Design a protein around this ligand. Sequence first.
Ligand SMILES: O[C@@H]1CCN(Cc2ccc(Cl)cc2)C1
Length: 460
Amino acid sequence: QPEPDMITIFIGTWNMGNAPPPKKITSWFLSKGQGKTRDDSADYIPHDIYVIGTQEDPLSEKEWLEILKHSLQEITSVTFKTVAIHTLWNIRIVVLAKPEHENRISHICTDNVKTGIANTLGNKGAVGVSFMFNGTSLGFVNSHLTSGSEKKLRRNQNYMNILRFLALGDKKLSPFNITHRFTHLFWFGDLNYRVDLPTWEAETIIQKIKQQQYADLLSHDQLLTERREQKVFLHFEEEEITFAPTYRFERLTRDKYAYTKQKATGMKYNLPSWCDRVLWKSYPLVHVVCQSYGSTSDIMTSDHSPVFATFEAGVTSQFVSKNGPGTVDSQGQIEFLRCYATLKTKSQTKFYLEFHSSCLESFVKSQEGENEEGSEGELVVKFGETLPKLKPIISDPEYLLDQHILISIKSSDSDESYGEGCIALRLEATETQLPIYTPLTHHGELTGHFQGEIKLQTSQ
Ligand SMILES: O[C@@H]1CCN(Cc2ccc(Cl)cc2)C1
C-alpha cells in the first residue's frame, strides 16, 4: 500500500447556542448549503480527517462523539477512529480519522488557552490539537473569541494570547509559536468579528443578504479589515466568502435574523455577521487547496449556522535511508550566501540565527552577524557568507526538496527570539545560488525580514 501524497481534511465550526443539535447534521459533513459547496458525486467519499470545533456546546464529550461517529457512519459506512477530543468550558475540538490512518498518526498533543483577566476570564479562549501524519505536522485551533461589535481590538488580543500560549507540536521548536510549528495550521471557530455598519442600516443589511449581494457587507467585515491592516491573522489565508452571514438567526428557521438589542444581549445589536470562520497557514510551496467553504441551511437549533471548509493538503512519507535518521548523509548540504536580517527593533544587541528542521539531527546556532544602519533607520544584521553549512540526515532529493528550515534571530544578550520565519527547500534548481526570503514575526507580529541566497546539494 503506497503512502499518500495528498489527504482531504474537513474543518467544521459550529456555535451550538447551548442547545442540543437536531437528529440529522449530515449536510454539515457533506459541505451542502450556501457558499462553495462540495460536488454531489463526492458524497460517499470519506475525508481522511474530520476536525469538529464547537462553541456554546451543551453536550458531554460522550454525547457529541456518538452523534459525530453515527453521522459519518451513515454518510460513508466507515467507523471513524477518535484521534483527540479536548474541551475548555463549552469550547470543544474533536479529531476523527479513517481507520487506515491509525498507524500514520502519532505525537498527538492537546491544549487550551483561557483569554482575559478576572472579569473577562470565564468562558472565552481556544482548544487545539496537533499530530504527525507520516512526515507532515498538522495543527488545529478552535477559538471562541470576545463577542460584541465594539470589541474587535479585544478579539485581536485574544488571538495573540492564543498563538503565544497554546502548547502544541514539537516542544524542541522552543523559539517558535504555533504559527511556525506545522506544515498546515487550521484556525477556526466563533471568531466573533462583525459587519461594522451603523445600527440604523440593519434592515438594509438584511435586504442585501436576501439578494445574495455580500460585497458591500464583506467590505465592512472586521476580520477582513483587521487582516488587511495586519492587526490579526498575519500570513493566514481565508477562502472567499460566498454564503450569507451565519449570525444572528432566530432558532428553528433561517428566514429571520434576530439583530435588535434585548436584555439577553446586554442591550447590544447583533447585526448579521460572519462570526464563524476557517483560516489556514501552510509552509511555503506546500500543496493546500480549499475545495469547500460554506454554511448549512437546514440545521437551525442554534442562533448560528454551522460552517464547513474542506481542504486538499500535501503530505509526505516518513523517509528512512541507509544513513539518516541517526546520522548525516554527507552527499547533502544546505549553504547560505549573502544573508542579512532586517529588524524593526530599536535595540542594539548582537544577534545570531538558529536553524531548526526535521531534516537536521538537531538545531544549529550560527555566529553573531554584523549590525549596520539601514538607509531608512532599520537595523540590518549582516551574516554575509558566515552562516554554517547545514548537514541534512537524508540527501535524497525526493525527501530533501519537501523540507523546510525554520529560522529564529536571537539576541546574544538574552537568547530571546526577535523574529521567526520559514524557508522552503522546494527550489527551482539544486547546486545553484537562488534567492530565499521569509518575513520574520514574533508573537505573530511582523518584526523584520530575512533574505539572501541558498545553494542546496542533494544525492542527484
Ligand atoms: O497571496 C495571498 C493571498 C492574499 N494575501 C495577502 C492578503 C492577506 C489578507 C488580506 Cl485581507 C488581503 C490580502 C496573500
